[PDB]
Amino acid sequence: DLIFCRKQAGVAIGRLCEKCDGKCVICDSYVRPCTLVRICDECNYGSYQGRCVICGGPGVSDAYYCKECTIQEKDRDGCPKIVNL
Amino acid sequence: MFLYNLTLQRATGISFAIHGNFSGTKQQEIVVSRGKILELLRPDPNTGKVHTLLTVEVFGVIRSLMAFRLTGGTKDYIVVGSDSGRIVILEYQPSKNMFEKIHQETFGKSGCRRIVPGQFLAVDPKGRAVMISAIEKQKLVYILNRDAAARLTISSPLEAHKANTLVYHVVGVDVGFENPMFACLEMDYEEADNDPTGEAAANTQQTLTFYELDLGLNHVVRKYSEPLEEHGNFLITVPGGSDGPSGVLICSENYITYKNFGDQPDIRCPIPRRRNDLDDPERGMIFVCSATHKTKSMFFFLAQTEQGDIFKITLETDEDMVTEIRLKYFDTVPVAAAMCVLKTGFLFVASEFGNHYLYQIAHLGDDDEEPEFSSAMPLEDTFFFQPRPLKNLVLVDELDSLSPILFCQIADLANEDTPQLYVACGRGPRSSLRVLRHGLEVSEMAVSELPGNPNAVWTVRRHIEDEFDAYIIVSFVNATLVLSIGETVEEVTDSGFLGTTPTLSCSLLGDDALVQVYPDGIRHIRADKRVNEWKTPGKKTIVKCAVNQRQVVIALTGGELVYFEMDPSGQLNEYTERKEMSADVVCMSLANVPPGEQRSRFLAVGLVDNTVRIISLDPSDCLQPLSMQALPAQPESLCIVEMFLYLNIGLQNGVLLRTVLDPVTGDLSDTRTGSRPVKLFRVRMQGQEAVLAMSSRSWLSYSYQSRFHLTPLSYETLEFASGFASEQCPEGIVAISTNTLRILALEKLGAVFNQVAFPLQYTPRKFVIHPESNNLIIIETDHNAYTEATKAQRKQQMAEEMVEAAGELAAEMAAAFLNENLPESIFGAPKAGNGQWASVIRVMNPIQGNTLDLVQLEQNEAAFSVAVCRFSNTGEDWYVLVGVAKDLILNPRSVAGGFVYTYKLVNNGEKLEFLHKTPVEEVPAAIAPFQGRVLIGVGKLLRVYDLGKKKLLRKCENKHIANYISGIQTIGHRVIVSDVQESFIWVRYKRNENQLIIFADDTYPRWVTTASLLDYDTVAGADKFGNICVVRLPPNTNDEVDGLLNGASQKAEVIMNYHVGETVLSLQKTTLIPGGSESLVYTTLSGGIGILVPFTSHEDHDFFQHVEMHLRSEHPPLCGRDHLSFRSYYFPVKNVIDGDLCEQFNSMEPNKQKNVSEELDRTPPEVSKKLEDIRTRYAF
Amino acid sequence: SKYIGTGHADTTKWEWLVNQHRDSYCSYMGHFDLLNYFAIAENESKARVRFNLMEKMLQPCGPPAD
Ligand SMILES: [Zn+2]
Ligand SMILES: [Zn+2]
Ligand SMILES: [Zn+2]
Q1: What DSSP letter does each residue of B493-521 carry, written as one string?
Q2: Which chains touch A (3+ CB pairs under 8 A)?
Q3: What SS3 class is residue B880?
Q4: Is B109 on the interface with A (CB under 8 A)?
């Protein structure tokens, strides 16, 4: 049930927690963070305002795509928030 | 092989154009889009000139361009939608002269895609919402707001997707501060994909859909949708709110409709037609562009048809309802892609091809007798009008544009030493052959040759607030003559100089105090008739001086440095110290003392010593040596100048030096550009300083906002010159030649080529050069075209049929219809028919423009190939071969046959005489001389042909080429074939076996447009999609042959791949400058010219690679594109460095220039010099 | 599957070919110098070529089978 949200991303910036701080959301790499992550409006609302996009804990820093995912334009899909059903 | 790309002349074709107050002031500017270049223009309301302010390469494909303004603001923004998945908003900064990116919003993947938005862009007329749309289901809406600091904020997008839907056009609707509305022309194709009968494809209508954005609820909803009568092209926003109703104008085939939601009925008006039209009666009529002009009292529209007819559309209204649409014929101009109506009464026309125009709207209102059509008028049958020459408009300016370039040849067809560029460009009756030369064009100002020995001429005015000069003083060897401008310039007496001996310095000393220096001394002259004279002690005689309106230094025999000064009293006081050195001066120069300071300090001194010495002259440390630097040769003159301070060093040869003004030299640049001494003279270009260097050829040296240019001029040698000013022309030059006294002018705002044009009849396809006479043999061909004879007989037919209209047979419009033919270069050619062609063969002299011979072909014959050659079985006679198609249909493709014509080219290459005509079963698309015979590509077939007495004799044939032969090129042993869809086939001709054998091919499909041989093994190719590639045979390649991929056994390797962004149609290896290196020059369909040059060392390649790497990150493309991804559009880049990205280093800000330069272990001036070196090595 | 133009093991020749015809026409509308080439080749205004391509967008390759 690890599925990405894949909704139209807005102006909200994705956040990472203390455990996931250096990670890439899509491929889980740690090398060369390149592009700032954007999330949709339903992922950024109320109690969901600041939360890790990978796990859902309290965010502390910005989420980034890696250079490898940026080269393949994998930052052009929807909201990359991990959502469980 | 590693290549460096440089642009020599940018594209000049316009795709979109918007107007607005982009600088925030009250003047209006236009932003035009080239394919990949953004450009800001400003037309002068005083003279009507259009000046270019800024031009930026965006490294993408611009697809939509809008302007918008927030409520209460005075500045317009720019919204750009491109082939990236981003929408960008830009702001022009007048004080920095650059485009500042305000916002970037990413929504999808890059490229020109079906369902990713970026093709359509609409904006709310009040500026609170913007809609970006694709051709398919996806649409997005952004809300635009403003914070308390008056900066622009953007929201997250709202989706309005709708599957199985096609969009023709989107516009925002003007409401009165109500919820924003957007109108769309839409079509649903779901039913058409499920019906195998094909009846759901027909019976399918366009809808006009309205989308309402509810700012209170924050969502987009479909409110209204209505089916239309027929399919329409673009929409027009009608101004609403408190000035006008709020609807849309739908432009359609033969009609224009007004529509609004509510209780408003639909109003239709048919488009008028030209009386006695010569075009095919089955064809309809559409509008191609529009322009709105809103005034605080009324509004109207300007729409143009495909024939180039502009009509003026007004709207007859009620309190809220519209009742009539009225159309009135306005004028005829070339077919435009965009039209902008400017306040202060100017109309800007950007044509689809050829030159662009700016018109003055001379006649406001409409007080005329010509009829006005209406929607209320009843007609069973259509309206008719008569096209006439311009009545409402006056032509004020014309901007040159090389788009579209179709064929090019670089060659020295005149007997200069520099080659010229012969360019067949243009389409239809506006085509032409243009000759391009590197230089500036000297405008003739005045000529009166007087006998004597002219040496020098100044242009000094009587006052300092004077814009009118006082005198011009040309010195003989025995005397001089000094004149004034009484608009009838001749001898003058009350000047006060009256020099019996020559005059070597004439300066404006005071406000109206003049310094006259001559070999026997100096006589300072007042405003009143008074002279104070200091003459020579004994036999020492001055030759050189250095003047300035506050201080005057002189040079007697022996380097005796004598400095004067004129203090606020207004008279002479000489300094105490006279420093003398070993030799006599040959050069010095005093910088123009600025109004900010009191006097000039630096004085470069060039002597027989061959050393520049820098000396101070302020009362603190005046006249004592500071720094000396030897010379490479004998100097003639130097000059401290600006446009920050530099000096220039002229040698006695045709070579130059440069050194930036400082206590120590900081920059160095030498250009081998003569064998004759350089003369450095003062002039003023662009209203600021510039130096006119002179040699066997005369050059102008001028930086331009850090754009250094050493450009020659289109005239031969001179010997002295300076600025000029008069009621006749307040800004010019006074130049002297052998047995001549000239005044000249230069009025071209920073161009690289000057061009002359010669008109043609149809679209030129290809031309060849006669080797003996240097004449050009051109073929011109057009589709949907009549020949001359068919036009004449069709017109006679229409006359005889309109005279028998069965009606008093008493008044003849037919004799008036037959007399004068409206010019096709102004009113267009009658485009009539679908399989109709028109072709012509022309012999032209390239020096003049005269047509030597003209052969017209039959109606439906279309020429595609031409060649000039000699046959071995004949003598030294020349022949011209023309390949012609017969009854060609393009879609679906069908042809009846082909012919090859043969002519004898007699009378010293001036006349063609028909010999015979050989039939072939397909279009002969390529003809190439080959070993005393000729090769012809007949569709899929490659044939050898020898000359016969009654026709051409087939000798050999290969039948294994894939699809269609589009080009043939031969190097002595081998043949290179271009396929329409496959790239390249290598063939060998077996001379003794009489065989054509394929021995190599490629592994990629390429849509080849042109090809160029680089050496015995390598070929340079171009593509329809905008790519250039280089293909080389491996060294293993065996030539002596008697498939592995369903192809040939041996393959060729691709060693170069580059995306240019525009379609290349010409490639040629040549040397552009005398004494330079060979480069690969290409030509583009948008009017651009560029080169690819090889690197010779690994160090230069590595340095430029690192520059490109670092500039890719810290200076990204403006519209959101990835630079490496753009040059890898269809294939990945291979061994090319983008020098158009690299030269953007000179236009960054100093902080980022330092951050970039300190990584390359270098300073910005060194990087700039290294960038200029490789450019001046090959190109200009 | 949600992207228009993708296929699967049951895709027919007709669907494949109409998909590539449709995105070919969109690519022609997008790229500025391809439309120039076509408008010079067939001697028409660029607005007319654009409108013709949009009209051809509806049913390229004819109506489907059976
Ligand atoms: Zn990643
Ligand atoms: Zn986490
Ligand atoms: Zn989400």
Answers
A1: STTS---SS--SEEEE-SSS-EEEEETTE
A2: B
A3: strand
A4: yes
Q: Where are the beta strands (DSSP E) in B686-814?
A: 688-694, 698-702, 709-712, 723-724, 732-735, 742-746, 753-759, 764-769, 776-783
According to CATH, the topology of domain B3-399 is Methylamine Dehydrogenase; Chain H (2.130.10)
Cα separation, B83 vs B61, whole angstroms:
5
Mutate one of A8, A44, A67, A72 to test the B interface: name it (highest B CB count within 10 A). A8
Count of domains observed in chain A:
1
Residue B370, amino acid: E
List CB contacts (< 8 A) between B111 and chain A: none
Task: Let me know: does B664 contact B634? Beta carbons within 8 Å.
Answer: no
- Find the domain containing A20 and state its range: 1-85
Residue B879 bridge partners (DSSP): B869
| Structure-token match 């052969």, residue found | B855
Taking phi over 0 as left and psi of -120 to 50 as alpha, with beta for the rest, B896 belongs to alpha
Kindly state the tokens that stand for B270: 């048919």
**B586 within 8 A of B596, measured Cβ to Cβ:** no
The rounded Å distance from CA B9 to ligand 3 centre is 48
Q: What is the dihedral of CA B152, B153, B158, B164, to 10 degrees?
A: 40
Question: Residue B954 has which token pair?
Answer: 């087939």
Which residues line ion ligand 3, judged by CB < 5 Å? A 5, 7, 40, 43, 79, 81
Best probe of the B interface among C4, C22, C32, by most B CBs < 10 A, is: C32
Closest C-alpha among B579, B635, B580 to residue B606: B635
B85 contacts A8? CB cut-off 8 A: no
Provide the experimental method for this PDB entry.
Answer: cryo-EM
B1157 conformational bin, left if phi > 0, alpha if psi -120 to 50, beta if neither = alpha
Assign domain B442-755 one CATH number from 2.130.10.10, 1.10.3880.10, 3.90.78.10, 3.40.50.80.
2.130.10.10
Distance separating alpha carbons of residues B1155 and B1134, to the nearest angstrom: 28
* Binding residue positions of A for Zn(2+): 5, 17, 20, 24, 27, 40, 43, 52, 55, 66, 69, 79
Q: Report strand pairing: B129-133 vs B373-374.
A: unpaired
Residues 410-429 of B with CB under 8 A from C: 427-428
Residue type, position B106, single letter = T
Q: Which ligand is nearest to the CA of A60?
A: 2
B441, B754 contact by CB (below 8 A) = yes
What's the gap in Å between C54 CA and the centre of ligand 1?
39
Q: Quick check: B1083 and B1065 in contact, CB under 8 A?
A: yes
Cβ–Cβ below 8 Å for C37 and B1063: yes
Determine contact, residues B612/B628, Cβ cutoff 8 Å. yes
CA pair distance B1097, B1103, nearest whole angstrom: 10
Backbone conformation region of residue B35, classed left if phi is above 0, alpha if psi is from -120 to 50, else beta: alpha
Chain breaks in chain B (C to N over 2.5 A) after: 380, 643, 673, 808, 1042
| DSSP assignments along B902-931, one per residue | EE--BTTTTB--EEEEEEESS-EEEEEEET
B684: Cβ contacts below 8 Å, ≥ 6 apart: B690, B723, B731
Nearest residue to B968 (alpha-carbon basis) of B842, B898, B881: B881
Tally of residues, chain A: 85
> Chain A: residue nearest B108 by CA?
A76
Q: Could you tell me if B504 and B514 are in contact, meaning their C-beta atoms sit under 8 angstroms apart?
A: no
Resolution (A): 2.5
**Which residues of A are part of a known binding site?**
5, 17, 20, 24, 27, 40, 43, 52, 55, 66, 69, 79
Q: In this structure, how many other beta carbons lie within 10 angstroms of the beta carbon of residue B86?
A: 22
Work out how many CB contacts closer than 8 A connect B with C.
122
